[PDB]
Amino acid sequence: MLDAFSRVVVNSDSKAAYVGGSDLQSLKTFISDGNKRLDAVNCIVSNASCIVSDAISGMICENPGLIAPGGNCYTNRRMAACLRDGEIILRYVSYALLAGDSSVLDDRCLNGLKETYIALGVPTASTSRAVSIMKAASTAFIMNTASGRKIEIAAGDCQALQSEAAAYFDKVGSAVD
Amino acid sequence: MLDAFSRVVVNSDSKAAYVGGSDLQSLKTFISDGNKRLDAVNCIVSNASCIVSDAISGMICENPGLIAPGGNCYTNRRMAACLRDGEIILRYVSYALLAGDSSVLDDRCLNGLKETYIALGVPTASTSRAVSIMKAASTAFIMNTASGRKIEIAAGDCQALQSEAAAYFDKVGSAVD
Amino acid sequence: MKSVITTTISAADAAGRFPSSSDLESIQGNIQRASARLEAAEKLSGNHEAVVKEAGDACFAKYSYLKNSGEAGDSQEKINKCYRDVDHYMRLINYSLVVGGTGPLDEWGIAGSREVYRTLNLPGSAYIASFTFTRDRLCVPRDMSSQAGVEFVAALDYVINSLS
Amino acid sequence: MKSVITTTISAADAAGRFPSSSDLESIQGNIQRASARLEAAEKLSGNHEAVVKEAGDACFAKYSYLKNSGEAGDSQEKINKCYRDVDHYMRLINYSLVVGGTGPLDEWGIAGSREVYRTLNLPGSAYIASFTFTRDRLCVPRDMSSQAGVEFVAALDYVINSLS
Amino acid sequence: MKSVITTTISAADAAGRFPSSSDLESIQGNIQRASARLEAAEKLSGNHEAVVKEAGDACFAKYSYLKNSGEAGDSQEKINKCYRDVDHYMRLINYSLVVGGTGPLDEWGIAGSREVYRTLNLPGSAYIASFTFTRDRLCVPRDMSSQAGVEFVAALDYVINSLS
Amino acid sequence: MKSVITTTISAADAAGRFPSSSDLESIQGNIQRASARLEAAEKLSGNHEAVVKEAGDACFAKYSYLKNSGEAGDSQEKINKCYRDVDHYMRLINYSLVVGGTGPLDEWGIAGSREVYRTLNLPGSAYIASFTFTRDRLCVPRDMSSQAGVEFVAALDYVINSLS
Amino acid sequence: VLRTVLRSPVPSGAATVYGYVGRGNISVILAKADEYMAKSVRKQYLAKSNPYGTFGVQCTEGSVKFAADFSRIRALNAEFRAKLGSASKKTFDMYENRKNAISNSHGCHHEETQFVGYKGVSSMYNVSKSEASGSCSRYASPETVVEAAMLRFMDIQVKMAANPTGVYNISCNEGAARGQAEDVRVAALNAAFRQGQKSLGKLLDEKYQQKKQGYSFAHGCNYEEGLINKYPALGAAFRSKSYGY
Amino acid sequence: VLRSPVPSGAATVYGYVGRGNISVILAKADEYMAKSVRKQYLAKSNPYGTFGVQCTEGSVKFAADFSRIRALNAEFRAKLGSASKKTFDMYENRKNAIS
Numbered sequence A, B: 001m002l003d004a005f006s007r008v009v010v011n012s013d014s015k016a017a018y019v020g021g022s023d024l025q026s027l028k029t030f031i032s033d034g035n036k037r038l039d040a041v042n043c044i045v046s047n048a049s050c051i052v053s054d055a056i057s058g059m060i061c062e063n064p065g066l067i068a069p070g071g072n073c074y075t076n077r078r079m080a081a082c083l084r085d086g087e088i089i090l091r092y093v094s095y096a097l098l099a100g101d102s103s104v105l106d107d108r109c110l111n112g113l114k115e116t117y118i119a120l121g122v123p124t125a126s127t128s129r130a131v132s133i134m135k136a137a138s139t140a141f142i143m144n145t146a147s148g149r150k151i152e153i154a155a156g157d158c159q160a161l162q163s164e165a166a167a168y169f170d171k172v173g174s175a176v177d
Numbered sequence C, D, E, F: 001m002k003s004v005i006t007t008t009i010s011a012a013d014a015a016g017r018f019p020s021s022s023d024l025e026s027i028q029g030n031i032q033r034a035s036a037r038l039e040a041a042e043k044l045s046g047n048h049e050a051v052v053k054e055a056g057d058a059c060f061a062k063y064s065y066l067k068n069s070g071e072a073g074d075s076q077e078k079i080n081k082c083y084r085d086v087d088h089y090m091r092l093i094n095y096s097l098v099v100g101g102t103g104p105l106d107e108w109g110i111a112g113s114r115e116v117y118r119t120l121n122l123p124g125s126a127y128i129a130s131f132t133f134t135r136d137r138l139c140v141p142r143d144m145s146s147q148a149g150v151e152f153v154a155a156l157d158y159v160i161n162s163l164s
Numbered sequence G: 001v002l003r004t005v006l007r008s009p010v011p012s013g014a015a016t017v018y019g020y021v022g023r024g025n026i027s028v029i030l031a032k033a034d035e036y037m038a039k040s041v042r043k044q045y046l047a048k049s050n051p052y053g054t055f056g057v058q059c060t061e062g063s064v065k066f067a068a069d070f071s072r073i074r075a076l077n078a079e080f081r082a083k084l085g086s087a088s089k090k091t092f093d094m095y096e097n098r099k100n101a102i103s104n105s106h107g108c109h110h111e112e113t114q115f116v117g118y119k120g121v122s123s124m125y126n127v128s129k130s131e132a133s134g135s136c137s138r139y140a141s142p143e144t145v146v147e148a149a150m151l152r153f154m155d156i157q158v159k160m161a162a163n164p165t166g167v168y169n170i171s172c173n174e175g176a177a178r179g180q181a182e183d184v185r186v187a188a189l190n191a192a193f194r195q196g197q198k199s200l201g202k203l204l205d206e207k208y209q210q211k212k213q214g215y216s217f218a219h220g221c222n223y224e225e226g227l228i229n230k231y232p233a234l235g236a237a238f239r240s241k242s243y244g245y
Numbered sequence H: 001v002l003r004s005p006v007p008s009g010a011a012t013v014y015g016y017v018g019r020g021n022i023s024v025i026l027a028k029a030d031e032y033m034a035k036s037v038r039k040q041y042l043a044k045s046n047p048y049g050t051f052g053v054q055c056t057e058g059s060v061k062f063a064a065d066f067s068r069i070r071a072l073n074a075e076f077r078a079k080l081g082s083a084s085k086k087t088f089d090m091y092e093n094r095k096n097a098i099s
C-alpha cells in the first residue's frame, strides 16, 4: 500500500540512491496540484452510490440476458452480489485516487479476483462493461459535465487527473478480463 | 475516544440542542492554540525513552526495596514489565495531549487499573511516585527547561498547556492509587 | 466518533506506537480546514428552523400520498414526527460539521437506520427529496462562504448517500 | 509504508467505508507540511557525505576502544562498513523525510535490527554518539530553514529512541 | 433447500447418526400435508396470469405516484418490469409450495433483496399492496379447498413478513 | 433430547428464524404417528416385569459361564443387578417410545456406556441375547396392534445396534 | 427473604464457577482485573498483527457500506450466547482452556501460575494466540484437490466430534433475527477472499505455524504428523473442543 | 485447486491457486519455457526472416482456420488420456529429451 511518495521512494531505493532534486520536482507537481485532487475525490465519493446504480443498471440495459434465467444477474442473491462488487470496485478506485498510485488497488482488490470470477463463472466482458460505465460516469462527474447534478467549483483545468482516474478504471477493466 | 470536539458535541447532545457560538468560541481558543500543542507533543514524544528510563531509575533510587529480593522489581522479567508499564502510561498521556480530552486515557488505560495492580500486588505508591517523576520531567521538557537537551523553538507562552499535561499526570497518579 | 484525531489515535493505539509526525500532519490539516466548516456550523445553528420547515414542506410538496390514509404520515402527530426527524438530521449535520468527519452523524443517525426505517415502513425517498431540496436551495456567495459551503454539501451528500 | 495517506486509506479499508472528509483533512496536512519537509530532504541529498564523515569521525573520536584489538571495528574494512551503515541511516532519514512519517525508516532500518546488532557485538551507543553529534552540529539559521530543521530533528530523534 | 427432509437429513448428517424414527415422523408429516398443498400448486399454475394482472393493477390503483415522473415505474417498460417481477414472486410461491417449507422462496427471492430494492429506489409497500390484494381476493370454498388454501396464505404471508 | 420437536426447534433456533411451515409438517407427522407409539407404550408399561424375567432367564440360558466364578454375574445379588440393568433398558424403551425418537434412550443409556461396560468386565453379547430373545418372542397380532409393534421393533433394534 | 435491600449481590455464574468470590469483597476486584487483563492480552496480539501501524488485510471488517455495524451486532450476540451456557459447559471450558493455555505456555512457570490464577485471560489467550499466529481454522487455505477434500472430511469428523446428538447447540448460532444469515454469508465469503489477498511472506509462516499447531494438537503419532507433513491445512482444522462449532 | 467454498467450522475457506502456491508457478513456467523452445526452433526454421515453404499451412481460402481447429482438438485429445499413457509419455519423452 503505497502512495506517490512511497512510489518515488521505492524507485529510488531500487536505484539505491537518494531521492534527489528531480524526483522531488515531480513530487512538487503532485503537492502543488493538491486540492484539485481533493475536490476530485470529493466529486466521485459524493455521487458514488448513484454511479454504482446507474452503471450496473446500464450494464443490464445493454444485454437483457443477465436478467434472463441462467444469466448471472438472475436472482436477488446474485444481483445483490453484483451491486456490492461494483460498489467495492469504485471504493478501491477512490482509494487509488487519493493515493496517486494504484498500489492499494493492485494489492487489496485486483490480486486474486480473475481466478475467482473464472471459478464462479462471472462473465468477464460484462464486468469490463460495468467498469467502463463507471469510468465514463465518473469522468463526467469529475469534469463537472454531468447533466443532472452540476455544482459550483472555482474553475481551472483538471484533465490530467481525469486521465489518471480513467487509467485506474482501465486497469481494473483490463484486469478482470 | 472523545477529543475536544467530541466533548463539545456530547455536551451539546446531553443539552439536546445545537452547538452555538460560546462552545465554538472555546473551540476557537483550542484551534487558535494549535501548533503550541503540536510542538509540545513533538517534545514529549521525542524524549520519551529518556523520561521512562530516568523516572523508573529514580523510582528505584528512592526506595531500594524494589530491587531487593521480594520486591516487585527483583528480576529482569519484572523490571522489563515495569519499564513497559511506564512507557505505556507515557504513551496514553501523549495521546491525551493530542486529544485535548482525557477520554482516551480514561477508557483505554484507566478503566480498572487500580483493581489490576491490587490483584497483582503491584505497590501503588511506587507507581504514583513514578508517575510523579514523569510528570516533572515531562513538564520540564514541555517548557524546554531541561538541563541536558534544549532545542531551538520560537518563543511564546506555554504555561496553560503545561497545566493541562500536569492535570493528565495527576489524573493517572490519582488513578493508580 | 470517526474523526481525524480519533482515527490517528486508533491507528497508533492499535499499533502500539508513539504518535509520530504523521499524526501531527493529520491534525495539522484538521486545524487548517477548521475555520471554514465551523463558520458553516455557526450558520446552521443560525437558521435551522427555516431549514427544517422548507425541508419538510418541499418534501410533502413532492410526495402528497403520505398524508393520504393508507401511507404512514397521515396524522398530525406523524407530520410532527416528520418535521422532528428532519430536525434530528440537521442537528447531526451540525454536529459532524463541528467535529470534522462523519462521526456524530454516522454513529447516531446512520448506523442501523436500515432496520428502523425498513421496519417502520418509512420511505427514504421522502428524506432524500428533503435533503436534495436543501442542497439545491443552498447558495454560493449570499449566505455563506463558498469553501465552507462545500463542507456543508459534503455532509448533506453523505446523508443522501447513506440513505439510498 | 506507514505514512499519512496510507494510514487513512488503511483505516478506511479496515473500516470498509468510502473515504470521507477526515482523510481529506489528513492529506491536506500532508500537502501543507510537505513544502517545509522536502527542503530538508534536498539539503540532506546535498551534503550527506560530510554528514557521514563527521558522524563517523566523531563516533570513533568518542569511542577509541573500537579500533583496539578486541572490539569489532579494528580493521579498515569494518570502519568502512561502519561508515556505510551510517550512510544507510542517513539515506533512510532522507527516505522517511520524503515520505512523511516513519515508515521507510521503521520497516527497513528498525525492524529486526535488535537481533542483528545484538548478534554481531554492535553497541548502540556508538550510533547514538554519531546521531547526537549531527544533532548538536545542526545549528539554527545558517544552512536550513528552522521549521524544516525541526522535522529533521524529529526523524533523527526517532532513530535514537528506536535504538536505545 | 430449506424443507422437511433436508432439515432432518441435514441434522442427521451433521450429527453423524442413522436416520431414526424421528426423521421418519418428519417425512410422515411431509407425506401427510403434501396433497393438499400440491393441489394449491396446481391451481396456481392454473391461473397465475390473472393473479399477476389484478395484483399489479391494484398495486398501481393504490400507488398512483409511481407512474408520475419522478418515481421509478413511470415508463411502459418498467411497469412491464413491475408486472414480470410479481410473476417471479408467484412462481416462487409455486416452487416453495411444491417443495414444502420456505426454501426456494427464501434463497431465490428473499435473500439479498434488501440491497437490491433499497438500491434501485424500489418501495416495498407497493409489493405488499399487491400481495395483500391477492390475499384479500382469496375467498374460501369457491376456488380452492380450505385447508390447502391456508398453505397458500402462509406462503404469501411469509413473503409479506419478509418484506416489511 | 433428540425428538421431532427438538430437531425442528434446534434447526430454527440455530438458523435464527420464526418457525415456518416445514417444522409444522414435521410436528404434524409427530401428532399423526403418536397414537400407534403411545399404544405400544401402554402395553410395555403393562407387562414389563415378565418381559425382564424372560429376557434375563433366556440371557443366562444362552450364557451359563456368567454364573461361573470368574465372570461377573456369579452371585444372586449380581443376578439381581443383571435384571435391574435390563429393567432400566425396558424402561428407557418406554421413555423413548413415548417421546418419539431415540433421545432419552441415547442420552441416558447409550452415551458413554462403552467405557462402563468395558470397565466392569460386562459382555454386551449377553444384553444382545436378551434383546433379540424379546424381539423374537414378540408377536404380530396376538398381543399388540401390528403397526405400533413395528415402532417397538425399531426401538429394540436401536438398542442392539447401539450396543454392538 | 434475602437480607440485602440494595445492590444485593448477584455474582454471575462465571464469577461463582471461578474462585473470585471471597472475604475481602474481592469479587469486585478480581472480576474487574480479569476484564482489564483480558483486553491487555488481546491488545498485545493485535499489536503483533500490525507492527507497522496500518491495519492489515486481516482487519478490514466489511466491504458493504453498513456491514461493519453488522459485525458489531454479531460480536455482542456471540458473547451473549457465550453467557447463556450451563454449569458443566462452563467447568469444561475453564479446564480445557486451562490445559491448552498451559500447553501453549511452553513451560514458563510464571505464566502457568497466572493461567491457573485467572480463568478469563487463559481463554482469550488461546483465542488471540491462535488468531495472531494465523494458525486456526478460519485461516486455513487448501492448495491441492486433496487438501480441500480432506478439509471437508476432517471438518465433518470434527463436527461429529462436537455434536454427537441431533439437536443443534447454541454455538452454531448462525442467525439471531431475520436477514442475519445472508449478511453473515456475505461477510464470511469476504473473509475467505480477504485471506486470498494476504502478503506472500505471511502465508508461508502461517503454513509453518498451522503445521506446529498440527503437531501439538494431533499428538506424538507417526500417522497424523505424517499427514500434516503431507498437508498443512489439517493443523488449522484441529479446533479445540472448547468451541462447540 | 479449484477455488470453491470449502467449509471449516465457522467460516468457509477459499483454496489458493494463485501467487504464492508453488504448483501454479511451476505450471506457468512449463508453458512459458515450452513456448520459448518452440519460438527458438521457429527462429531456426526461418533465419532470413521470410516464412518458409513448410509454414504455408494451406491453399484453400478457409483451410488455415481448419488447421487451427484441428490443433486445439488434438490438445484436447492429449488431455483426455488415461493414467498409464500419461506417465508412459512423461518417462519416454524424458529419456528421449535426455538422449
Ligand SMILES: *CCC1=C(C)C(=O)N[C@H]1Cc1[nH]c(/C=C2\N=C(C[C@H]3NC(=O)C(CC)=C3C)C(C)=C2CCC(=O)O)c(CCC(=O)O)c1C
Pocket: A047, A050, A051, A054, A057, A058, A061, A133, A136, A137, A138, A140, A141, A145, A146, A147, A148, A149
Ligand atoms: C443517478 C446517477 C447519475 C447521476 C446523478 C447523473 O448525473 N447521471 C447518472 C450517472 C451517469 N450515467 C452516465 C452514463 C450513461 N448512463 C447510461 C445508462 C442510461 N442510458 C440508457 O439508455 C438507460 C436505459 C433507458 C439508462 C439507465 C448510459 C448508457 C450512459 C452512457 C454510456 C457511455 O458509453 O458513455 C454518466 C456519464 C454521462 C453524463 O451524464 O455526463 C453519468 C454521470
Ligand SMILES: *[C@@H](C)C1=C(C)C(=O)N[C@H]1Cc1[nH]c(/C=C2\N=C(C[C@H]3NC(=O)C(CC)=C3C)C(C)=C2CCC(=O)O)c(CCC(=O)O)c1C
Pocket: B050, B051, B054, B055, B057, B058, B059, B061, B062, B132, B133, B136, B137, B138, B140, B141, B145, B146, B147, B148, B149
Ligand atoms: C533523561 C536521561 C533525562 C534528561 C535527558 C534530562 O535532562 N533529565 C532527565 C529527565 C528529567 N528528570 C527530571 C526530574 C527528576 N528526576 C529525578 C530522578 C533523579 N533524582 C535522584 O535523586 C535520583 C537518584 C540519585 C535520580 C535517578 C527526580 C527525583 C526529579 C525531580 C522530581 C520532582 O518531583 O520534580 C526532570 C525535570 C527536572 C529538569 O531536569 O528540568 C527531567 C527533564
Ligand SMILES: *[C@@H](C)C1=C(C)C(=O)N[C@H]1Cc1[nH]c(/C=C2\N=C(C[C@H]3NC(=O)C(CC)=C3C)C(C)=C2CCC(=O)O)c(CCC(=O)O)c1C
Pocket: E002, E006, E007, E010, E011, E014, E106, E107, F011, F014, F015, G159, G168, G171, G172, G173, G174, G181, G182, G184, G185, G186, G188, G189, G245, H005, H009, H010, H011, H012
Ligand atoms: C455452526 C458451526 C453450525 C453447525 C454445527 C451446523 O450444523 N451448521 C451450522 C449452523 C447452521 N447454519 C444454518 C443455515 C445457513 N447457514 C448459512 C451460512 C453458510 N451458507 C453459505 O453460503 C455460506 C458462505 C459460503 C455460509 C457461511 C446459510 C446461508 C444458511 C441457510 C439460511 C436460510 O435462509 O435458511 C443452519 C440451518 C440449516 C441446517 O444445517 O439444518 C444451521 C444449523
Ligand SMILES: *[C@@H](C)[C@H]1/C(=C/C2=NC(=C\c3[nH]c(C[C@H]4NC(=O)C(C=C)=C4C)c(C)c3CCC(=O)O)/C(CCC(=O)O)=C2C)NC(=O)[C@@H]1C
Pocket: D043, D044, D046, D047, D050, D051, D054, D134, D135, D137, D138, D139, D140, D141, D142, D143
Ligand atoms: C550554528 C548554530 C552552529 C554552527 C554550525 C556550523 N556547522 C558547520 C559545518 C558543517 N555542519 C554540517 C552539518 C549540517 N550540514 C547539513 O547539510 C546538515 C543536514 C542536512 C547538517 C546537520 C556539515 C556537514 C558541515 C561541514 C560543511 C560546511 O562547512 O557547511 C560549521 C562550519 C565550521 C564548523 O565545523 O563548526 C558551522 C559554524 N557551528 C557553531 O559553532 C554554531 C553553534
Ligand SMILES: *[C@@H](C)[C@H]1/C(=C/C2=NC(=C\c3[nH]c(C[C@H]4NC(=O)C(C=C)=C4C)c(C)c3CCC(=O)O)/C(CCC(=O)O)=C2C)NC(=O)[C@@H]1C
Pocket: E043, E044, E047, E050, E051, E054, E134, E135, E137, E138, E139, E140, E141, E142, E143
Ligand atoms: C369469496 C369468499 C369472495 C369472492 C371471490 C371471488 N374472486 C373472484 C375472482 C377472481 N379471484 C381471483 C383470485 C383467486 N383466483 C385464483 O386462481 C387464486 C389463486 C391461485 C386467487 C387468489 C382472480 C384472479 C379472479 C378473476 C378470475 C375469476 O373470475 O375467477 C370473484 C369473481 C368476481 C370478483 O372479482 O369479485 C369472486 C366472487 N368475492 C367475494 O366477494 C367473496 C367475499
Ligand SMILES: C=CC1=C(C)[C@@H](Cc2[nH]c(/C=C3N=C(/C=C4\NC(=O)[C@H](C)[C@H]4CC)C(C)=C\3CCC(=O)O)c(CCC(=O)O)c2C)NC1=O
Pocket: A033, A035, A036, A037, A038, A039, A040, A042, A142, A143, A144, A153, A154, A155, A156, A157, A158, C033, C147, C150, D021, D024, D025, D028
Ligand atoms: C478538505 C476538502 C477539500 C476539498 C474538497 C478541496 C476544495 C478546494 N478546491 C480548491 C481549488 C480548486 N478546485 C478545482 C477543481 C476543479 N475545478 C474545475 O473547474 C473542475 C470542475 C474541478 C476538477 C476537480 C480547481 C480548478 C481549483 C482551483 C485551482 C487550484 O487551486 O489548483 C481550493 C483552493 C481554495 C479556494 O478555491 O478557495 C480548495 C480548498 N480542498 C480541500 O481541502
Ligand SMILES: C=CC1=C(C)[C@@H](Cc2[nH]c(/C=C3N=C(/C=C4\NC(=O)[C@H](C)[C@H]4CC)C(C)=C\3CCC(=O)O)c(CCC(=O)O)c2C)NC1=O
Pocket: B033, B035, B036, B037, B038, B039, B040, B042, B142, B143, B144, B153, B154, B155, B156, B157, B158, C024, C025, C028, D033, D147, D150
Ligand atoms: C507539523 C508539525 C508542526 C509542529 C511541530 C508545529 C511547529 C510550529 N510552532 C510554531 C510556533 C510556536 N511553537 C511554540 C511552542 C513553544 N514555545 C516555547 O517557548 C515552548 C518551549 C514551546 C511549548 C510547546 C510557540 C510558543 C510558538 C509561537 C507561538 C504560536 O505560534 O502560537 C509554528 C508557527 C510558525 C513559525 O514559528 O515559524 C509552527 C509551524 N506546527 C506544525 O505544524
Ligand SMILES: C=CC1=C(C)[C@@H](Cc2[nH]c(/C=C3N=C(/C=C4\NC(=O)[C@H](C)[C@H]4CC)C(C)=C\3CCC(=O)O)c(CCC(=O)O)c2C)NC1=O
Pocket: D066, D072, D073, D074, D078, D079, D081, D082, D083, D085, D086, D088, D089, D108, D109, D116, D120, D122, D123, D126, D127
Ligand atoms: C538498510 C539498513 C542497513 C543497515 C543500517 C545495515 C546494518 C548491518 N550491519 C551489518 C554488519 C556490520 N556492520 C558493521 C558496522 C560497525 N563496525 C563497527 O566497528 C561499528 C560498531 C559499526 C559502524 C558504526 C560491521 C563491522 C558489520 C560486520 C560485522 C561482522 O561481520 O562482524 C549487517 C549484517 C550484514 C552485513 O554483514 O553487511 C547489517 C544488516 N545493513 C542494512 O541493510
Ligand SMILES: C=CC1=C(C)[C@@H](Cc2[nH]c(/C=C3N=C(/C=C4\NC(=O)[C@H](C)[C@H]4CC)C(C)=C\3CCC(=O)O)c(CCC(=O)O)c2C)NC1=O
Pocket: A057, A060, A067, A073, A074, A075, A076, A079, E056, E059, E066, E072, E073, E074, E077, E078, E079, E081, E082, E083, E085, E086, E088, E089, E108, E109, E116, E120, E122, E123, E126, E127
Ligand atoms: C428471481 C426473482 C426476481 C425478481 C422478483 C426480480 C427483482 C428485480 N427487479 C429488478 C428491477 C426492476 N423491477 C421493477 C419493478 C417495478 N416497477 C414499478 O413501478 C414497481 C414498483 C415494480 C413492480 C411492482 C423495475 C421498474 C425494475 C427496473 C428498475 C430500474 O432500472 O429503475 C431487478 C434488477 C435487475 C433488472 O433490472 O431486471 C431485480 C433483481 N428479478 C429477479 O430475478
Ligand SMILES: C=CC1=C(C)[C@@H](Cc2[nH]c(/C=C3N=C(/C=C4\NC(=O)[C@H](C)[C@H]4CC)C(C)=C\3CCC(=O)O)c(CCC(=O)O)c2C)NC1=O
Pocket: F056, F059, F066, F072, F073, F074, F078, F079, F081, F082, F083, F084, F085, F086, F088, F089, F108, F109, F116, F120, F122, F123, F126, F127
Ligand atoms: C440407566 C441405565 C442403567 C443401566 C442399564 C445400568 C448399567 C450398569 N450396570 C452396572 C453394573 C452391573 N450390571 C450387572 C449386570 C450383569 N450381570 C451379569 O451376570 C450379566 C452379564 C448382566 C445382566 C444381564 C452386574 C453384575 C453389575 C455389577 C458388576 C460388578 O460390580 O462386578 C453399572 C455400574 C454401577 C453399578 O454397580 O450398579 C452400570 C452403570 N445402570 C444404569 O444406571
Ligand SMILES: C=CC1=C(C)[C@@H](Cc2[nH]c(/C=C3N=C(/C=C4\NC(=O)[C@H](C)[C@H]4CC)C(C)=C\3CCC(=O)O)c(CCC(=O)O)c2C)NC1=O
Pocket: G037, G038, G040, G041, G044, G045, G106, G107, G108, G109, G110, G111, G114, G121, G125
Ligand atoms: C494478564 C496476563 C498476561 C500474561 C501472563 C502474559 C502472557 C503473554 N506472553 C506473551 C509473550 C511472551 N511471553 C514471553 C515469556 C517467556 N520467555 C521465555 O523465555 C520464557 C519461556 C517465558 C517467561 C517465563 C515471551 C518471550 C513473549 C514474547 C514471545 C515472542 O514474541 O516470541 C503474550 C503475547 C503478547 C506479547 O508479546 O506480550 C502474552 C499474552 N500477557 C498477559 O497479558
Ligand SMILES: C=CC1=C(C)[C@@H](Cc2[nH]c(/C=C3N=C(/C=C4\NC(=O)[C@H](C)[C@H]4CC)C(C)=C\3CCC(=O)O)c(CCC(=O)O)c2C)NC1=O
Pocket: G150, G153, G154, G157, G158, G161, G218, G219, G220, G221, G222, G223, G224, G227
Ligand atoms: C481426515 C483426517 C482425519 C484425522 C487426521 C483424524 C483425526 C481424529 N482423531 C480422532 C480420534 C482419535 N485419534 C487418536 C489417535 C491417537 N492415539 C494416541 O495414542 C496418539 C496420541 C494418537 C495417534 C498418533 C485416538 C486415540 C482417537 C480417539 C480418542 C478418544 O476417543 O479418546 C478424531 C475424532 C473422531 C474419532 O474418534 O475418530 C479425529 C477427527 N480423523 C480424520 O478424519
Ligand SMILES: CCC1=C(C)/C(=C\C2=NC(=C\c3[nH]c(CC4NC(=O)C(C)=C4CC)c(C)c3CCC(=O)O)/C(CCC(=O)O)=C2C)NC1=O
Pocket: G042, G045, G046, G049, G058, G059, G061, G071, G072, G074, G075, G078, G127, G128, G129, G130, G131, G132, G134, G135, G136, G137, G138, G139, G140, H010, H011
Ligand atoms: C483462525 C483463528 C480463529 C478465529 C479467527 C476463530 C474465531 C472467530 N473469530 C471471528 C471473527 C473475528 N475475529 C477477529 C479478531 C482478529 N483478527 C485479526 O487479524 C487479529 C490479529 C485479531 C485479534 C487477535 C476479527 C477481526 C474478526 C472479524 C470481525 C467479526 O466477525 O467480529 C469469527 C467469525 C464469526 C464470529 O465473529 O464468531 C470466528 C469464527 N477461531 C479460530 O481458531
Ligand SMILES: CCC1=C(C)[C@@H](CC2=N/C(=C\c3[nH]c(C[C@@H]4NC(=O)C(C)=C4CC)c(C)c3CCC(=O)O)C(CCC(=O)O)=C2C)NC1=O
Pocket: C006, C007, C010, C011, C013, C014, C015, D011, D014, D015, G046, G047, G050, G055, G059, G061, G066, G067, G068, G069, G071, G072, G073, G075, G076
Ligand atoms: C463489542 C463488539 C464490537 C467489535 C468487535 C467492534 C467491531 C468494529 N470495528 C469497527 C471498526 C474498526 N476496527 C478497526 C480495527 C481494530 N482497531 C484497531 O486500531 C486495530 C489494531 C484493530 C484490529 C485489532 C479499525 C481500524 C476500525 C475503524 C475505526 C477506527 O478508527 O478505529 C466498527 C465500526 C464499523 C463502522 O464504522 O461501520 C465496528 C462495529 N465493535 C463492536 O461493537
